[PDB]
Design a protein around this ligand. Structure first.
Ligand SMILES: [N]S(=O)(=O)[C][C][C][C][C][C]C123[B@@]45[B@]67[B@]89[C@@]1%10B81%11B698B746B814B562B%10%1143
Ligand SMILES: [Zn+2]
Length: 257
């Protein structure tokens, strides 16, 4: 099955998922000089005050913090979006070392990690229907650099020991994702895809310019997770990022001057 190794990594995905070589694949390099300021873009509205986290899951490729998405409790709107998008989960991508780990790059710079807050368009009723639509998902991407600790991340870090291996989950209630946001909501946006199989071309990407800082100790704990299941040969969960894909016939727009 697909993963991040020599024999099953991103360069192989196209055999099972031919859309891997499609016209709107993610991630991409953001060339900051070429991205056009678009004065028609609105401020992003991130309304997470009523967010209800439920659980954290090691799915064998990352860990997902899952939310109750059975009502409009945690929603993204505005920015480039029409309508209302409901938070379903967040997860990260990260490296074996601090010099790599992000999926998007900024003028070819790789960050240590990248947070993806995944939301689906309520007009399609459920996540599974939304991923079949070109405007089905909105993913808010946030870069992580290593420096000062992010206090709002520590609750996530401390539960990782309990979900070391693939298929393990843990109750994860009352986690506030507002504690993962940078100060500024300045962003870039473009049309793209899921960055993992099935690589569906259903995402409006919103990538924040301002990174968050996390400590070396925090990211080291991400790197103790395992891709393998319990009792299997240990394969550290590191380098679970897809590299930048061809931009093709797309424009990246900036919300800021
Ligand atoms: N890295 S990222 O932020 O671009 C991606 C996060 C998207 C979550 C989408 C995966 C699935 B799993 B369930 B439902 C969706 B349909 B079925 B299975 B298929 B896979 B696809
Ligand atoms: Zn992701």
């Amino acid at each position: 099955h697909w993963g991040y190794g020599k024999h099953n990594g991103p360069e192989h995905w196209h055999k099972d998922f031919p859309i891997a070589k499609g016209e709107r694949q993610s991630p991409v390099d953001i060339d900051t000089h070429t991205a056009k300021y678009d004065p028609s873009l609105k401020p992003l509205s991130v309304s997470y005050d009523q967010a209800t986290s439920l659980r954290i899951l090691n799915n064998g490729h990352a860990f997902n913090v899952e939310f109750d998405d059975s009502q409009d409790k945690a929603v993204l709107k505005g920015g480039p979006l029409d309508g209302t998008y409901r938070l379903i989960q967040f997860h990260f991508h990260w490296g074996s070392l601090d010099g790599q780990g992000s999926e998007h790059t900024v003028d070819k710079k790789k960050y240590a990690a990248e947070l993806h807050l995944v939301h689906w368009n309520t007009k399609y009723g459920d996540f599974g229907k939304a991923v079949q639509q070109p405007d089905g998902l909105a993913v808010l991407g946030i870069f992580l650099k290593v420096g000062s600790a992010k206090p709002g991340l520590q609750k996530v870090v401390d539960v990782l020991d309990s979900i070391k291996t693939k298929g393990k989950s843990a109750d994860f209630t009352n986690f506030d994702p507002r504690g993962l946001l940078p100060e500024s909501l300045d962003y870039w946006t473009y049309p793209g895809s899921l960055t993992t199989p099935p690589l569906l071309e259903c995402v409006t990407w919103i990538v924040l310019k301002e990174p968050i800082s996390v400590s070396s100790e925090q990211v080291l704990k991400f790197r103790k997770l395992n891709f393998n299941g319990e009792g299997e040969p240990e394969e550290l969960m590191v380098d679970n990022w897809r590299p930048a894909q061809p931009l093709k016939n797309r424009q990246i727009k900036a919300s800021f001057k």
